[PDB]
Design an enzyme around this catalytic site. Structure first.
Site, PDB file in Angstrom:
ATOM      1  N   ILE A   1       9.837  -5.986   3.418  1.00 28.62           N
ATOM      2  CA  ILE A   1      10.525  -7.273   3.438  1.00 28.62           C
ATOM      3  C   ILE A   1      11.665  -7.230   2.426  1.00 28.62           C
ATOM      4  CG2 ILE A   1      10.236  -9.782   3.092  1.00 28.62           C
ATOM      5  CD1 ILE A   1       8.542  -8.640   5.400  1.00 28.62           C
TER       6      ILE A   1
ATOM      7  N   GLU B   1      -5.517  -8.213  -3.849  1.00 25.88           N
ATOM      8  CA  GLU B   1      -6.356  -7.216  -4.533  1.00 25.88           C
ATOM      9  C   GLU B   1      -7.650  -7.795  -5.113  1.00 25.88           C
ATOM     10  OE1 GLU B   1      -4.654  -3.664  -6.724  1.00 25.88           O
ATOM     11  OE2 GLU B   1      -5.157  -4.980  -8.418  1.00 25.88           O
TER      12      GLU B   1
END
Ligand SMILES: [Hg+2]
Ligand SMILES: [Hg+2]
Ligand SMILES: [Hg+2]
Length: 260
Positions: free
Chosen positions: A60, A218
């Site tokens: 991106i 995460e």
């Protein structure tokens, strides 16, 4: 199907493969280090099944600049000999570089069910990386995570898990096997979709309760892999940062690394 005749060194029951590292988890999943596997045996097993591996990246904004080196190095090191389908998710389809691929390898650009019909395994990584050595079928399994290179020698109290009980990603100080990286996980398509569905649902509940986990995706990955034990764990060979961490004796290969 049967393996063919193969000539290789006999495994030695009374010689450990590595004396310096843990090579199997307490739930009997292998921990993948150099020296633990014979790649010729594994390549045979996976080729006989005509295995297709999907490799997913998000690129991106400024990160599209990392695709060229990522794909070029993947061509040299990632699943060479096997069927590979790259899936590049990007906001800039026209900025994806035209990289030459080996036979049996393809790339789809997705602008931002199909996975079930197209690949057998999904591998999910960050784009701002490069392959420097072999990353092959030794990793493939129903569900795998990768040991974070900054935490593999740490006590569990030092792991940067989410510690607030208000978060769905909460892990208390007395729980935890490993600290897994958000940037390299995978498995069967089914198991990866289960994982991402669970994490997306947990993130929504947290969002609804006004909390964001300390290390975002995460943190939730770590909670998921605590509760659903991976069937293989990759060593930090599989995601390293040489600039930050150097090259310790324990690493015989640096396979996939950060790009400064
Ligand atoms: Hg993925
Ligand atoms: Hg998520
Ligand atoms: Hg996740």
């Amino acid at each position: 199907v049967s393996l063919p005749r193969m000539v290789y060194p006999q495994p030695k029951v009374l010689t450990p493969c590595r004396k310096d590292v843990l090579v199997v988890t307490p739930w009997l999943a292998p921990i993948v280090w150099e020296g633990t596997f014979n790649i010729d045996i594994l390549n045979e097993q996976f080729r006989l099944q005509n295995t297709t591996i999907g490799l997913t990246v998000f690129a991106i904004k400024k990160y599209v600049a990392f695709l060229k080196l990522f794909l070029e190095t993947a061509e040299k090191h990632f699943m060479v000999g096997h069927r590979v389908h790259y899936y590049v998710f990007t906001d800039q389809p026209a900025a994806v570089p035209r990289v030459t691929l080996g036979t049996g390898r393809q790339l789809s650009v997705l602008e931002v069910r199909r996975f079930l019909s197209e690949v057998d395994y999904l591998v999910c990584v960050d784009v701002d990386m490069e392959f420097r050595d072999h990353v092959g079928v030794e990793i493939l399994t129903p569900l795998f995570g990768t040991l974070h290179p900054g935490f593999y020698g740490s006590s569990r109290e030092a792991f940067t898990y989410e510690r607030r009980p208000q978060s769905q990603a909460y892990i208390p100080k007395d729980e935890g096997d490993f600290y897994y990286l958000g940037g390299f996980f995978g498995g069967s398509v089914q198991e990866v979709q289960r994982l991402t569905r669970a994490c997306h649902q947990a993130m929504m509940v947290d969002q609804a309760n006004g909390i964001e986990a300390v290390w975002h995706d995460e943190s939730h990955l770590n909670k998921y892999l605590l509760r659903h034990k991976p069937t293989k764990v990759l060593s930090p060979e599989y995601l390293w940062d040489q600039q930050l961490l150097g090259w310790p004796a324990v690493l015989r290969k640096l396979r996939f690394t950060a790009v400064p």
